[PDB]
Structures are given as C-alpha cells and as structure tokens.
Amino acid sequence: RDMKHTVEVMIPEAEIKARIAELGRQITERYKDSGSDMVLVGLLRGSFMFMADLCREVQVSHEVDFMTASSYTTRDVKILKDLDEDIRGKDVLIVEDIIDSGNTLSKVREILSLREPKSLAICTLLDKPSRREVNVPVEFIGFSIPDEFVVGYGIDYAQRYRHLPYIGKVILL
Amino acid sequence: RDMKHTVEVMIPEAEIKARIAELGRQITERYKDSGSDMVLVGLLRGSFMFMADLCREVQVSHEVDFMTASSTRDVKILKDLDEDIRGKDVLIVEDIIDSGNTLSKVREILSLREPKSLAICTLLDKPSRREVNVPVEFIGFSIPDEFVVGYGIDYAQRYRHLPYIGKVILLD
Amino acid sequence: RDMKHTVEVMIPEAEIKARIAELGRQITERYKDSGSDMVLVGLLRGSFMFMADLCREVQVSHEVDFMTASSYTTRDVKILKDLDEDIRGKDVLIVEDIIDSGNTLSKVREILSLREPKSLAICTLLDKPSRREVNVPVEFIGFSIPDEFVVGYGIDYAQRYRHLPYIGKVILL
Amino acid sequence: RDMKHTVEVMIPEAEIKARIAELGRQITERYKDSGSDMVLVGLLRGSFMFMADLCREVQVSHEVDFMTASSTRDVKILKDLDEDIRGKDVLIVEDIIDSGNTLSKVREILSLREPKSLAICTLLDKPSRREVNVPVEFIGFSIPDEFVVGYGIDYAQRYRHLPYIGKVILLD
Ligand SMILES: O=c1[nH]cnc2c(CN(CCCP(=O)(O)O)CCCP(=O)(O)O)c[nH]c12
Ligand SMILES: O=c1[nH]cnc2c(CN(CCCP(=O)(O)O)CCCP(=O)(O)O)c[nH]c12
Ligand SMILES: O=c1[nH]cnc2c(CN(CCCP(=O)(O)O)CCCP(=O)(O)O)c[nH]c12
Ligand SMILES: O=c1[nH]cnc2c(CN(CCCP(=O)(O)O)CCCP(=O)(O)O)c[nH]c12
Ligand SMILES: [Mg+2]
Ligand SMILES: [Mg+2]
Ligand SMILES: [Mg+2]
Ligand SMILES: [Mg+2]
Incomplete structure (x- = not known):
C-alpha cells in the first residue's frame, strides 16, 4: 500500500471495448429466448465501470442491481449491502471485475442461489486461473491473465487508479 | 394499521421471567461442555428484549450479535452480523415464529458460513400458522392463533416496550 | 485484547435495576405532556440490554429503533445501519451504554438532528467525564464513573462479557 | 408502473459522450491544483453509468466511492461510503435532479464529515420541478419537464441499460 511504483498499459482501452462488445453478443444470445x-448484479466497488459498459452492449431488456460483500486472516463473507430488487424466477448474471481466489464470489453465488433464480451465471472481465482456491462456475470471461498485479477499470491499488480507462500493470520500483 | 382495538394480557411478566429462567438452564446445559x-444471534428488531433477558440467564461465556432481515418476496439482509460465526456454536434468538418463512431463509444464509452448530431459540411459537417446517430446539411458549404484542413485538410500531405479552382485540 | 485478566463486580445487578427505575420516572415526566x-434510539450493539430494561420503565407510549455507527486512527463516523422509522416531528431519546470521548455520539446526534425531530436528548447508562473530547448535551445519566475499564451489561472486552447482568471491572494480571 | 408507453430519444448517445467530455475538462481544471x-461520490443506483464515463474523463488522481440513500419522509442511509472524506475534495455525482430533496439532505450529511470542499455534479437537471434550491456547480443538461429514462435512470426498474437519455410517452 506504501511502495514506489508506476503504471504501464497492459490491456488498452480499445481492446477492452472490443472484447466487451463480443461479450455483449454472447450474453445476448444466451438469454434472448428466455422470456423471464x-x-x-454487480459487486461493488470494482464492477461499476465494467457494469456500465457491459449492460449497454447487452441487447436484452434487463434490470441493473448492486450488492457489496465483506472484504478481508480467513473471515466470513458478510453482506454490507444487499440487492434492492428480488431475483427469484429471474435470469441473474453476476458481473465481476476480476476473479483470483474466487472465495467471495463462490459464497455470493451460494447466497443468491438460496433465493432460487431461474438461472445464475457469472461474467468477469479478468480471470486469474493461477490464484484459484475454490472452483466456481464462470460462464463468461473477458481476459485470462497470468498472476500479474493489475489496476484500472474499477480495480484499485490503495484506492487508486479506479478511474483508468485501461487495464494497467503496476511496476514496483 | 389504524384500527380501533384493545390489548388484553396473554402472558404476564412473571410468567415470561420464569420461563426465560428455565430456557436459560436448558441452553446452558446444552452448550456448557462444547469447548467452542x-x-x-438476535433478529432485529423484535427480539432485542428477549435477547437481553435470555443471555443474562445463559451461564456460559458467549458473544452477542444481531442481524436485520427483510420480508411473497425474497429475504434480504439489511444489516449483517458484525462478527464471524465459522466454527462457533450459534444460537438464533427470535421473538416469534408464525409462518417460519423468515427463520427458514435466515437459517439457510447462516448455515453457509459453516458454524460448528446452528440452533434456534424462539420465545413465542404459533404453530397453527406455520407454512414451513423449521426445526426449533428451544420454545418458550406455543401460543394460540392470536395477534400478539409487547416484549419487542409490535403492532404498527406500537407496544414494543410492554413487559408482558398481550393480544390485540379489535372492536366490532 | 489478549491479556490475562479477571472480573469483579463494580455496580451490582440490583443497583442497576434501581437506578434504571429512577431514570424511567425522570424520562416519563419529561415527555408525558408532549403529545407528539x-x-x-439505541446504538448497537452496546445499548441492547440497557434499551430493553429502560424502555420497560418508561411509562409513555413510544417506539423502539436501532442504528449502528462505524467504530474505529481518526476516521469518519459512518452509518452501517440506519433507523427503520422516521423521526421528524418526534421526541427522540438516544440510548447509549457509555460515554467516554463522545466523538461518535456527537456525530450521531448531528446526523439525526438533520431529520428535524421535535426534541433530541441523550440517555446514557455510564458516563466518564474524564475522557470527554467533545462536549455533548446529555440530559440523563445513570452513573458517573472514573476512568475505569468496565465491562458487562452490553459493554464488551474483545467481544466478551456482554451478557453480564452487572457492570464489572477487569483486573489485568 | 404498468402503464402502456413508448420511449422517444431526448439526448442521443453521441451528445452525452460529447457533453461528458466537456464536463471532464471543467472538473479537471478546477481540481488539478488542489494538493488534497x-x-x-456516486448516488446508487441511477448514477453508476454516469460515474463510470465521467471519472474516465477526469484527468486528476482521485478515488471513486458510492452511497445509497432512501426517500414526504426522512432521507436515510441504506449504504454509507466505504472510505473517509475528511479533508478531501468531494464531488457528488448524481444522475438527475428534479426536486432536489434527496441531494439537499445527502449534501448535509456529507458536510458533517468536514471535507475540504463539497461540490455536486449532475448529468440531468430539471429546474421546472425544483422544490429546494441546492447549489450545483456542474450540469450536463437542463431538461424540459419530461419523465426521462436510460443511462442509469429507470422507469419501474426498466431501461437503465440504454446508452441514451429517452423520454417516456404514455398512450392515450
Ligand atoms: O491484481 C489485483 N489488484 C487489486 N486487487 C486484487 C485482489 C483482491 N480482490 C480485489 C479487492 C476487493 P476490495 O478491497 O476493493 O473490496 C479481488 C478478489 C476477487 P475474488 O475473491 O472473488 O477472486 C486480487 N488481485 C488483485
Ligand atoms: O402475532 C404477531 N404479532 C406481531 N407481529 C406478527 C407477525 C409478523 N412479524 C413476525 C413474522 C414471523 P414469520 O411469520 O415470518 O415466521 C414480522 C414483522 C417483522 P418487522 O416488524 O421488522 O417488519 C406475525 N405474527 C405476529
Ligand atoms: O471501558 C470500556 N470498555 C469497553 N469499551 C470502551 C470504549 C470504546 N467504545 C465502546 C466500543 C464500541 P464497539 O467496538 O463495541 O462498537 C465507547 C465509545 C462511546 P463514545 O465514543 O460515544 O464516547 C471506551 N471505554 C470502554
Ligand atoms: O425524469 C425521471 N425519470 C426517472 N426517475 C425520476 C425521478 C425519481 N428519482 C430521482 C429523484 C431525484 P429528486 O426529485 O429527489 O431531486 C428517484 C428514484 C430513486 P430510486 O430508483 O432508487 O427509488 C424524478 N424524475 C425522474
Ligand atoms: Mg470484484
Ligand atoms: Mg423476529
Ligand atoms: Mg455505545
Ligand atoms: Mg440519483
């Protein structure tokens, strides 16, 4: 949190926009004939930018909701802010910025599943298979990256760089 | 919500105090040799009073935490617990169980956090209106099909401060 | 949080019950002719026991609500859980377990005051004038104690002793 | 909530994108030499989209936080901020201001935490229905008395995902 560093571009703004466009088409085809x-559902705070761009590329009538889960050395996953609307009998797509361990995301899916939605999938922008500690079903993935320390596009470093339009890598000096 | 009514006594303060003492000894005997x-865990708001009296009758070193749930519709968490319950003996403290919809869903959510044991203690039980068979190990009173008030329990945000359990009787 | 210790009785259960009875009569007289x-309003978690005993000794029709404020090195006072009901045009009595610095309580009163209640008073069970950092108007006080490390009656020590029916002092060994 | 209607365009996506760029340069020029x-601070839910696009146009190192407020009645905090704002330059990011009741009360609450500066940026402003004179330093569009949808803003939880601002037109 307190180290000399700099930021290089890893995934340019244009690459993200192109990849999100594709994701939008995939998500659209999977749910266009659903009816329900x-x-x-976005996980605050990291998902807000990804959510804003993604939902605009989804050509299906849908609602947008958010929830906040507890961030932590091993602790219970607690809900700091639940959803505003009901999800039973609905098609729910959890929208995440990045999956590493998948601990929090695994628990969140469990909690949501109890409310018995019609379907329940997960869409993350970034994925680190390397750091996975719990196997979680992830239907849509934007980018698979190695164990790199990334920032930008909602992802922070000591609350910094959330507003970068590009995914960047931090170089410790 | 604005109906003319009266409140008759159903369970006097002395009866509650005595019954809670008994619940205390039972809860104590169960968890005294746990080693965990x-x-x-109290469910706000209706159970704050029951909780305060109950934990004072539980002769084992324990923690006190609270949770606020919503309402048919989905059961959402307005205020989650403050502390972790993983590997702990958890006793859910509820004022009254009518249908059991809320308890059922709250127990599910907490069970996901993998506590050593998960049990429920309710002051009032109204089985004539149960829709879901939830398992309760401690019950203070099984009551008739009456709309009860007092002791944390309210009627349109009224009567929570009554030291006794009463029943609402509407005028004709 | 990790020290060898023991607990002695400082304020017996019976003394608390007697003092709360008196508080109930005072509070009753101050608001019996109000009309509104x-x-x-109780501040979780420390106030739950005091709230339960106090509201029963208040012979005036009233509502019971709770809220949770952020606990912390100097940080903003944040609301983890707000009130469930409205308080504008109402007689509001904040119910606290203990006042030391009065920092959190001062901010909480400010936040509540914005909602424009008819009146706004504070009732605490214990009071340490010694540790006061901010001057807060406190109309009702159960006990004034010196700077002693107390537990019990909703007050904890590493989440312990909340359930003690008596106010106790911890003796570090 | 269940009324038959249509959605006509009021502000096209290109116009929003261009206007947000301008807002970006203005916000940047104001806070670039602050040293704090x-x-x-975005007000959920309606402002998530505006926030995402706006902060990408703000060329100064800043933090992004969110807050959820309620609704007449009292304005309560369902979800407070995650980080402190004391001694910081705070910019409240809101989707639309009709009456200004919520903004007015939210600004009061945040001001209590004594930030270095407290300002408001709204995408849409509908001054024909303002009940409280709240001070706004940045406004994307001042709009006619129409029920707008899209771009985070909803009609009965519908249309939040529209890339443009539209207006709801009921059928006769
Ligand atoms: O490369 C990173 N940059 C910044 N943060 C992180 C994290 C920690 N974490 C992000 C931080 C969450 P926050 O402190 O903003 O509430 C990712 C966990 C997602 P998962 O448990 O469902 O897999 C993991 N990796 C990174
Ligand atoms: O006999 C009763 N007296 C008063 N209330 C009730 C209820 C409803 N009450 C208890 C419901 C228990 P359930 O039927 O879910 O098993 C819910 C109120 C929660 P809120 O005040 O935070 O909104 C059910 N029965 C009674
Ligand atoms: O003697 C004590 N025992 C246990 N805790 C404490 C505290 C800290 N604090 C109690 C702890 C609050 P918690 O960590 O339970 O959320 C009292 C602050 C009240 P104020 O700021 O309005 O004056 C101060 N004194 C004691
Ligand atoms: O033109 C509009 N389109 C859509 N909605 C609105 C509103 C009401 N909308 C904005 C109110 C702003 P205010 O009138 O307080 O200045 C409140 C919805 C909050 P919620 O979805 O979390 O419950 C006011 N105007 C419009
Ligand atoms: Mg995330
Ligand atoms: Mg209950
Ligand atoms: Mg307190
Ligand atoms: Mg808004």
Missing part, C-alpha cells in the same frame, strides 16, 4: 426477467 | 466459542 | 410521538 | 485527495 433478467438482472445484472 | 458460542454466539447468540 | 416518541422514539427511543 | 479527491473523491467522486
């Missing part, structure tokens, strides 16, 4: 109500 | 941390 | 709706 | 930490 659909809702995209 | 114990926590009483 | 009344609500007792 | 900056934070954009």
Whole structure:
C-alpha cells in the first residue's frame, strides 16, 4: 500500500471495448429466448465501470442491481449491502471485475442461489486461473491473465487508479 | 394499521421471567461442555428484549450479535452480523415464529458460513400458522392463533416496550 | 485484547435495576405532556440490554429503533445501519451504554438532528467525564464513573462479557 | 408502473459522450491544483453509468466511492461510503435532479464529515420541478419537464441499460 511504483498499459482501452462488445453478443444470445426477467448484479466497488459498459452492449431488456460483500486472516463473507430488487424466477448474471481466489464470489453465488433464480451465471472481465482456491462456475470471461498485479477499470491499488480507462500493470520500483 | 382495538394480557411478566429462567438452564446445559466459542444471534428488531433477558440467564461465556432481515418476496439482509460465526456454536434468538418463512431463509444464509452448530431459540411459537417446517430446539411458549404484542413485538410500531405479552382485540 | 485478566463486580445487578427505575420516572415526566410521538434510539450493539430494561420503565407510549455507527486512527463516523422509522416531528431519546470521548455520539446526534425531530436528548447508562473530547448535551445519566475499564451489561472486552447482568471491572494480571 | 408507453430519444448517445467530455475538462481544471485527495461520490443506483464515463474523463488522481440513500419522509442511509472524506475534495455525482430533496439532505450529511470542499455534479437537471434550491456547480443538461429514462435512470426498474437519455410517452 506504501511502495514506489508506476503504471504501464497492459490491456488498452480499445481492446477492452472490443472484447466487451463480443461479450455483449454472447450474453445476448444466451438469454434472448428466455422470456423471464433478467438482472445484472454487480459487486461493488470494482464492477461499476465494467457494469456500465457491459449492460449497454447487452441487447436484452434487463434490470441493473448492486450488492457489496465483506472484504478481508480467513473471515466470513458478510453482506454490507444487499440487492434492492428480488431475483427469484429471474435470469441473474453476476458481473465481476476480476476473479483470483474466487472465495467471495463462490459464497455470493451460494447466497443468491438460496433465493432460487431461474438461472445464475457469472461474467468477469479478468480471470486469474493461477490464484484459484475454490472452483466456481464462470460462464463468461473477458481476459485470462497470468498472476500479474493489475489496476484500472474499477480495480484499485490503495484506492487508486479506479478511474483508468485501461487495464494497467503496476511496476514496483 | 389504524384500527380501533384493545390489548388484553396473554402472558404476564412473571410468567415470561420464569420461563426465560428455565430456557436459560436448558441452553446452558446444552452448550456448557462444547469447548467452542458460542454466539447468540438476535433478529432485529423484535427480539432485542428477549435477547437481553435470555443471555443474562445463559451461564456460559458467549458473544452477542444481531442481524436485520427483510420480508411473497425474497429475504434480504439489511444489516449483517458484525462478527464471524465459522466454527462457533450459534444460537438464533427470535421473538416469534408464525409462518417460519423468515427463520427458514435466515437459517439457510447462516448455515453457509459453516458454524460448528446452528440452533434456534424462539420465545413465542404459533404453530397453527406455520407454512414451513423449521426445526426449533428451544420454545418458550406455543401460543394460540392470536395477534400478539409487547416484549419487542409490535403492532404498527406500537407496544414494543410492554413487559408482558398481550393480544390485540379489535372492536366490532 | 489478549491479556490475562479477571472480573469483579463494580455496580451490582440490583443497583442497576434501581437506578434504571429512577431514570424511567425522570424520562416519563419529561415527555408525558408532549403529545407528539416518541422514539427511543439505541446504538448497537452496546445499548441492547440497557434499551430493553429502560424502555420497560418508561411509562409513555413510544417506539423502539436501532442504528449502528462505524467504530474505529481518526476516521469518519459512518452509518452501517440506519433507523427503520422516521423521526421528524418526534421526541427522540438516544440510548447509549457509555460515554467516554463522545466523538461518535456527537456525530450521531448531528446526523439525526438533520431529520428535524421535535426534541433530541441523550440517555446514557455510564458516563466518564474524564475522557470527554467533545462536549455533548446529555440530559440523563445513570452513573458517573472514573476512568475505569468496565465491562458487562452490553459493554464488551474483545467481544466478551456482554451478557453480564452487572457492570464489572477487569483486573489485568 | 404498468402503464402502456413508448420511449422517444431526448439526448442521443453521441451528445452525452460529447457533453461528458466537456464536463471532464471543467472538473479537471478546477481540481488539478488542489494538493488534497479527491473523491467522486456516486448516488446508487441511477448514477453508476454516469460515474463510470465521467471519472474516465477526469484527468486528476482521485478515488471513486458510492452511497445509497432512501426517500414526504426522512432521507436515510441504506449504504454509507466505504472510505473517509475528511479533508478531501468531494464531488457528488448524481444522475438527475428534479426536486432536489434527496441531494439537499445527502449534501448535509456529507458536510458533517468536514471535507475540504463539497461540490455536486449532475448529468440531468430539471429546474421546472425544483422544490429546494441546492447549489450545483456542474450540469450536463437542463431538461424540459419530461419523465426521462436510460443511462442509469429507470422507469419501474426498466431501461437503465440504454446508452441514451429517452423520454417516456404514455398512450392515450
Ligand atoms: O491484481 C489485483 N489488484 C487489486 N486487487 C486484487 C485482489 C483482491 N480482490 C480485489 C479487492 C476487493 P476490495 O478491497 O476493493 O473490496 C479481488 C478478489 C476477487 P475474488 O475473491 O472473488 O477472486 C486480487 N488481485 C488483485
Ligand atoms: O402475532 C404477531 N404479532 C406481531 N407481529 C406478527 C407477525 C409478523 N412479524 C413476525 C413474522 C414471523 P414469520 O411469520 O415470518 O415466521 C414480522 C414483522 C417483522 P418487522 O416488524 O421488522 O417488519 C406475525 N405474527 C405476529
Ligand atoms: O471501558 C470500556 N470498555 C469497553 N469499551 C470502551 C470504549 C470504546 N467504545 C465502546 C466500543 C464500541 P464497539 O467496538 O463495541 O462498537 C465507547 C465509545 C462511546 P463514545 O465514543 O460515544 O464516547 C471506551 N471505554 C470502554
Ligand atoms: O425524469 C425521471 N425519470 C426517472 N426517475 C425520476 C425521478 C425519481 N428519482 C430521482 C429523484 C431525484 P429528486 O426529485 O429527489 O431531486 C428517484 C428514484 C430513486 P430510486 O430508483 O432508487 O427509488 C424524478 N424524475 C425522474
Ligand atoms: Mg470484484
Ligand atoms: Mg423476529
Ligand atoms: Mg455505545
Ligand atoms: Mg440519483
């Protein structure tokens, strides 16, 4: 949190926009013939930018909701802020910025599943298979990256760089 | 919500105090030799009073925590617990169980956090209106099909401060 | 949080019950001729036991509500859980377990005051004038104690002793 | 909530994108020489999209935080901020201001935490329905008295994902 560093571009703004466009088309095809109500659920705070760009590329009538989970050395996954709307009998797509361990995301899916939605999938922008500690079903993935320390596009470093339009790598000096 | 009514006594303060003492001895005897941390989890708002009196009758070192749930519809968490319950003996403390919809869903959520044991203690039980068969190990009173008030329990945000359990009787 | 210790009785269960009875009579006289709706507001978690005993000794029709404030090195006072009901045009009595610095309580009163209640008073069970860092108006006080490390009656020590029916002092060994 | 209607365009995506770029340069020029930490505070849910596009146009190192408020009645905090704002330049990011009741009360609450500066940036402003004179330093569009949807803003939880601002037109 307190180290001399700099930031290089890893995934340019244009690459993200192109990849999200594709994701939008995939998500659209998977839920266009569903009929039931659909809702995209974002995990604050990292997902807000990804959510904003993604939901615009989804050509299906859907709702947008958010929830906040507890961040932590091993502790219970607690809900700091639940969803505003109901999800039972609905198509729910959890929208994440990045999956590493998948601990929090695994628990969140369990909690949501109890509310018995019609379907329940996960869409993450970044994925680190390397750091996975729990196997979680992830239907849509934007980028698979090695264990690199990335920032930008909602992802922070000591609350910094959330507003970068590009995914960047931090170089410790 | 604005209906003319009266409140008759159903369970006097002395009866509650005595029954809670008994519940205390039973809860104590169950968890006294556990060797794992114990926590009483109250469901706000209606159970604050029951919780305060109950934990004072529980002669084992335990923690006290609270949780606020919502409402048919989905059961959402307005205020989650403050502390972890993983590997702990958890006792859910609820004021009253009518249908059991809320308890059922709250127990599910907490069970996901893998506590050593998960049990429920309710002051009032109204089995004539149960829709879901939830398992309760401690019950203070099984009551008739009456709309009860007092002791944390309210009627339109009214009567929570009554030291006794009463029943609402509407005028004709 | 990790020290060898023991607990002695400082304020017996019976003394608390007697003092709360008196508080109930005072509070009752101050608000019996008000007319407006009344609500007792408790600060979780320390206030739950004090709230339960106090509201029963208040012979005035009132509502009971709770809220949780952020606990922390100097940080913003944040609301982890707000009130469930409205308080504008009402007689509001904040119910606290203990006042030391009065930092959190001062901010909480400010936040609540913005909602424009008819009146706004504070009732605490214990008071340490010694440790006061901010001057806060406190209309009702159960006990004034010196700077002693107390537990019990909702007050904890590493989440312990909340359930003690008596106010106790911890003796570090 | 269940009324038959249509959605006509009021502000096209290109117009929003261009206007947000301008807002970006203005916000940047104001806070570029502050020397104090900056934070954009969004009011959920309706402002997530505006926030995402806006902060990408703000060329100063800042933090992004969110807050959920309620609704007449009292304005309560369902979800408070995650980080402190004391001694920081705070910019409240809101989707639309009709009456201004919520903004007015939210600004009051945040001001209590004594930030270095407290300002408001709204995408849409509908002054024909303002009940409280709240001070806004940045406004994307001042709009006619129409029920707008899209770009985070909803009609009965619908249309939040539209890349443009539209207006709801009921059928006769
Ligand atoms: O490369 C990173 N940059 C910044 N943060 C992180 C994290 C920690 N974490 C992000 C931080 C969450 P926050 O402190 O913003 O609430 C990712 C965990 C997602 P998962 O448990 O479901 O897999 C993991 N990797 C990174
Ligand atoms: O006899 C009763 N007296 C008063 N209330 C009730 C209820 C409803 N009450 C208890 C419901 C228990 P459930 O039927 O879910 O098993 C819910 C109120 C929660 P809130 O005040 O935070 O909104 C059910 N029965 C009674
Ligand atoms: O003697 C004590 N025992 C246990 N805790 C404490 C505290 C800390 N604090 C109690 C701990 C609050 P918690 O960590 O349970 O959320 C009292 C602050 C009240 P104020 O700021 O309005 O004056 C101060 N004194 C004691
Ligand atoms: O033109 C509009 N389109 C859509 N909605 C609105 C509103 C109400 N909308 C904005 C209110 C702003 P205010 O009038 O307080 O200045 C409140 C919805 C909050 P919620 O979705 O979390 O419950 C006011 N105007 C419009
Ligand atoms: Mg995330
Ligand atoms: Mg209950
Ligand atoms: Mg306190
Ligand atoms: Mg808004």
